[PDB]
Amino acid sequence: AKILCVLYDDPITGYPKSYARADVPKIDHYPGGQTAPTPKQIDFTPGELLGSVSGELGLRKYLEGLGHTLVVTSDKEGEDSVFERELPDAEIVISQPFWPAYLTPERIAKAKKLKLAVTAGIGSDHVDLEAAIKNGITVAEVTYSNSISVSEHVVMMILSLVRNYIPSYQWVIKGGWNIADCVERSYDLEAMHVGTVAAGRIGLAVLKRLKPFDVKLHYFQRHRLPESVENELGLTYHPSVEDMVKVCDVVTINAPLHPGTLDLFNDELISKMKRGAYLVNTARGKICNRDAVVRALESGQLAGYAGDVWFPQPAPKDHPWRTMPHHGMTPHISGTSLSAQARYAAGTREILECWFEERPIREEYLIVDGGKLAGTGAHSYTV
Amino acid sequence: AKILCVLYDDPITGYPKSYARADVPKIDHYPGGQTAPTPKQIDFTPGELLGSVSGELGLRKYLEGLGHTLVVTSDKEGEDSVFERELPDAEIVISQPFWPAYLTPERIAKAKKLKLAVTAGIGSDHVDLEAAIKNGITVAEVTYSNSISVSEHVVMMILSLVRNYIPSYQWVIKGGWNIADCVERSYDLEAMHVGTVAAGRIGLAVLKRLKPFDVKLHYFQRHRLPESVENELGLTYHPSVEDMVKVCDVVTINAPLHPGTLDLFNDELISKMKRGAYLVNTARGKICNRDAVVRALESGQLAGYAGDVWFPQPAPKDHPWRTMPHHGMTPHISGTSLSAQARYAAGTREILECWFEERPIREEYLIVDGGKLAGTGAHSYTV
Numbered sequence: 001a002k003i004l005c006v007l008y009d010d011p012i013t014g015y016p017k018s019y020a021r022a023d024v025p026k027i028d029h030y031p032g033g034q035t036a037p038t039p040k041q042i043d044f045t046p047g048e049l050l051g052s053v054s055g056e057l058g059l060r061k062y063l064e065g066l067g068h069t070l071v072v073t074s075d076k077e078g079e080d081s082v083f084e085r086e087l088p089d090a091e092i093v094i095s096q097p098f099w100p101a102y103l104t105p106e107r108i109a110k111a112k113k114l115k116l117a118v119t120a121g122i123g124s125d126h127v128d129l130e131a132a133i134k135n136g137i138t139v140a141e142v143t144y145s146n147s148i149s150v151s152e153h154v155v156m157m158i159l160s161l162v163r164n165y166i167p168s169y170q171w172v173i174k175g176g177w178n179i180a181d182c183v184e185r186s187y188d189l190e191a192m193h194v195g196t197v198a199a200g201r202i203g204l205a206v207l208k209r210l211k212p213f214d215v216k217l218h219y220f221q222r223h224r225l226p227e228s229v230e231n232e233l234g235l236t237y238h239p240s241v242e243d244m245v246k247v248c249d250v251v252t253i254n255a256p257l258h259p260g261t262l263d264l265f266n267d268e269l270i271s272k273m274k275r276g277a278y279l280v281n282t283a284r285g286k287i288c289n290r291d292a293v294v295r296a297l298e299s300g301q302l303a304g305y306a307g308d309v310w311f312p313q314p315a316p317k318d319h320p321w322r323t324m325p326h327h328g329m330t331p332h333i334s335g336t337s338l339s340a341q342a343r344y345a346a347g348t349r350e351i352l353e354c355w356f357e358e359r360p361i362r363e364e365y366l367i368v369d370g371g372k373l374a375g376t377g378a379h380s381y382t383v
Numbered sequence: 384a385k386i387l388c389v390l391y392d393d394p395i396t397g398y399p400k401s402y403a404r405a406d407v408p409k410i411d412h413y414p415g416g417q418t419a420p421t422p423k424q425i426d427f428t429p430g431e432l433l434g435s436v437s438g439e440l441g442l443r444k445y446l447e448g449l450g451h452t453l454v455v456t457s458d459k460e461g462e463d464s465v466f467e468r469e470l471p472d473a474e475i476v477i478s479q480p481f482w483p484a485y486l487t488p489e490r491i492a493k494a495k496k497l498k499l500a501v502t503a504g505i506g507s508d509h510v511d512l513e514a515a516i517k518n519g520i521t522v523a524e525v526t527y528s529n530s531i532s533v534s535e536h537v538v539m540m541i542l543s544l545v546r547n548y549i550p551s552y553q554w555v556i557k558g559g560w561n562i563a564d565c566v567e568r569s570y571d572l573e574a575m576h577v578g579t580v581a582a583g584r585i586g587l588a589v590l591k592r593l594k595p596f597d598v599k600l601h602y603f604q605r606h607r608l609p610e611s612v613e614n615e616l617g618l619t620y621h622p623s624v625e626d627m628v629k630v631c632d633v634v635t636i637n638a639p640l641h642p643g644t645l646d647l648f649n650d651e652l653i654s655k656m657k658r659g660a661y662l663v664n665t666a667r668g669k670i671c672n673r674d675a676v677v678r679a680l681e682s683g684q685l686a687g688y689a690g691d692v693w694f695p696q697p698a699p700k701d702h703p704w705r706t707m708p709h710h711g712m713t714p715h716i717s718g719t720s721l722s723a724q725a726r727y728a729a730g731t732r733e734i735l736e737c738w739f740e741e742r743p744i745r746e747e748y749l750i751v752d753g754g755k756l757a758g759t760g761a762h763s764y765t766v
């Protein structure tokens with residue numbers, strides 16, 4: 001069998017020979033009890049670069065040792081590329097959302113042998129779920145593997161927007177001081193109203209982290225959390241996005257991309273937010289209308305916007321989120337920290353082992369299986 | 384009486400005509416129960432720029448209503464400055480740590496009428512305390528007014544260093560994507576060992592905010608906290624800084640500048656930290672040896688440094704912290720967010736109202752009074 005694995009390029013300075021620290025903390029389990037991934041073995045040391053071409057997610061010796069062939073490449077765009085050329089032979093396709101091999105219906109129609117599409121990470125919107133259901137393709141992702149990582153990125157970006165971190169760092173590099181230029185748009189987060197769209201693995205983790213900042217917490221999702229959980233964190237639930245955003249100084253989006261959330265934050269919804277509200281989006285790019293975000297930033301309806309997710313990915317050189325005012329963007333990185341890579345690489349291997357040993361894949365990893373949304377997919381997604 | 388007040392310049396784009404938001408949250412008290420400042424009146428709306436020359440800390444109408452004069456300038460360095468020229472006459476001198484009117488022994492000795500030195504903010508190391516003591520000068524500061532603001536900046540900076548926020552932002556601006564370049568030094572904070580030097584108003588607030596990030600917490604002070612709080616936040620006490628930093632992935636400094644902390648983090652102490660440790664200093668610049676920090680970053684002993692405090696202030700154009708590798712600096716801004724300004728501006732007025740009506744200044748505002756360290760000064764400072 002042939003496994004088709006798309007990963008991002010090595011660093012332009014070469015694949016690293018050393019690292020800033022000697023190791024990473026050992027993460028045994030996640031909040032709520034889900035165990036860390038359980039592959040029989042890992043062919044890497046946590047802390048190493050696994051998500052790039054040279055890292056191979058630590059998969060080669062395990063796969064080739066079973067008699068399979070593994071194609072690793074970063075070349076994912078075009079019909080004469082390595083990905084789309086190898087696709088008709090692939091039984092298994094793997095890729096990361098940070099450098100996603102888009103599985104369109106046209107590409108799935110060509111992938112005659114494809115049975116398993118693995119998201120090395122969290123979030124399978126780059127796969128056409130409707131077409132995968134149609135063709136009997138199983139879709140899995142490493143649920144929870146980088147949820148905590150993203151929640152850290154969120155609190156970081158909220159604080160950077162509100163406190164005006166990045167323009168202030170820029171005065172340091174320009175040789176200035178310019179206190180009044182830094183702080184004429186610098187506020188404390190303390191006692192602001194913060195609301196999250198979704199209170200799942202990331203959302204709940206953001207709410208727990210936000211709590212000791214003494215903010216007023218808000219959340220909107222289709223199903224409420226346990227009342228006991230709400231009272232312990234001081235949460236107000238809202239039946240609609242609209243009802244939540246109208247009283248929020250800061251909004252975080254932590255929902256998956258599916259028809260319920262596509263183009264959710266458009267001109268209309270953003271106009272219902274508070275004047276000068278801050279918007280953070282580490283979820284998926286297309287949940288916010290690209291031009292509606294730019295446009296509320298230029299007017300001041302949004303005081304700032306930040307996130308790591310774009311559409312498409314990679315973002316083109318002229319993508320307007322690069323140049324819109326008052327942003328604190330990164331490329332899609334929060335879920336591919338070295339710490340997180342250790343977890344979703346182990347989880348990717350666990351899924352493969354389950355596939356090739358004809359053991360069932362963890363129910364929480366599943367998105368679609370047997371021609372339907374299944375597992376976490378039926379809980380979090382819509383088609 | 385004459386009040387001489389030193390403030391930073393208005394923005395180079397002009398004193399703002401509008402703000403990103405309509406108001407800021409009203410802060411009633413601080414954690415632990417200390418009330419917010421209690422002036423009889425304020426002549427500003429919270430959220431306005433008060434710490435620049437045009438803001439005047441909202442003091443002019445009040446002071447001139449009583450027949451006093453108020454002289455305001457930013458020109459503060461050297462014997463040939465508006466500040467030094469106006470000083471021999473002043474009964475009261477006010478400045479902010481972010482743009483500090485340094486009250487050396489020489490300047491204090493020439494201030495023939497000086498009886499009160501107020502810090503519009505927190506931290507009175509810019510006043511020579513021994514000379515104030517000897518000359519019978521009251522030194523006061525608005526205790527707690529921006530402690531929470533700094534605790535926010537700290538967590539922002541820890542996350543930025545560890546997750547590698549700023550270089551990844553620059554890849555966005557350069558038109559790139561470059562995941563592996565961003566994340567070859569990107570880590571999660573989760574389960575790292577983090578310790579603070581001091582667990583005071585800032586340091587405790589830092590520890591409370593870091594706890595739900597699931598770090599292992601450490602601290603060092605001169606006075607150990609009781610069991611109740613050490614057990615409630617999972618704190619490990621260390622009897623010295625040396626003992627703390629050798630087990631810490633991340634170190635925060637949150638003590639005042641006095642002889643017990645001057646040059647604390649020198650080459651020798653920094654060399655006992657873990658290889659690849661991250662160092663955050665929102666406390667005072669001189670607590671870290673300027674060149675030792677540069678050396679440790681150039682050698683990889685420190686994986687990152689970040690803070691907002693420099694020496695001297697303003698830092699000159701060629702100050703090596705602007706250009707050392709792997710920094711996430713800002714100018715001195717954390718304690719002068721618009722929200723923090725409302726509090727210490729109200730606190731400056733409360734102190735002046737107490738001065739002129741011969742009411743006692745809040746003991747906790749006091750640093751030196753009656754020829755000795757007093758109030759908070761005796762709790763936190765040494766001479």
Ligand SMILES: NC(=O)c1ccc[n+]([C@@H]2O[C@H](COP(=O)([O-])OP(=O)(O)OC[C@H]3O[C@@H](n4cnc5c(N)ncnc54)[C@H](OP(=O)(O)O)[C@@H]3O)[C@@H](O)[C@H]2O)c1
Nearest residue numbers: 122123147198200201202221222223255256260283335380
């Ligand atoms: N590097 C990154 O930036 C990064 C990394 C990982 C994940 N992500 C994104 O973040 C998504 C979620 O992460 P996760 O680990 O927290 O997954 P999760 O644990 O399954 O949580 C998803 C939550 O979205 C809720 N929600 C679903 N549909 C909604 C809707 N139409 N409106 C409002 N809320 C809705 C769901 O709750 P209800 O059923 O009650 O509505 C669920 O609680 C992922 O799918 C991925 O797209 C980004």
Ligand SMILES: NC(=O)c1ccc[n+]([C@@H]2O[C@H](COP(=O)([O-])OP(=O)(O)OC[C@H]3O[C@@H](n4cnc5c(N)ncnc54)[C@H](OP(=O)(O)O)[C@@H]3O)[C@@H](O)[C@H]2O)c1
Nearest residue numbers: 505506530581582583584585604605606638639643718763
């Ligand atoms: N904008 C800014 O960046 C900003 C704003 C405000 C303040 N600051 C700086 O941060 C300092 C602290 O702020 P704060 O609000 O937390 O004042 P604070 O409530 O008095 O806290 C002072 C803490 O320093 C401790 N400490 C004192 N001497 C020490 C020593 N020799 N070694 C180790 N720890 C020592 C004290 O604990 P022990 O007595 O037990 O040792 C105390 O917990 C301020 O003095 C100021 O310089 C910066």
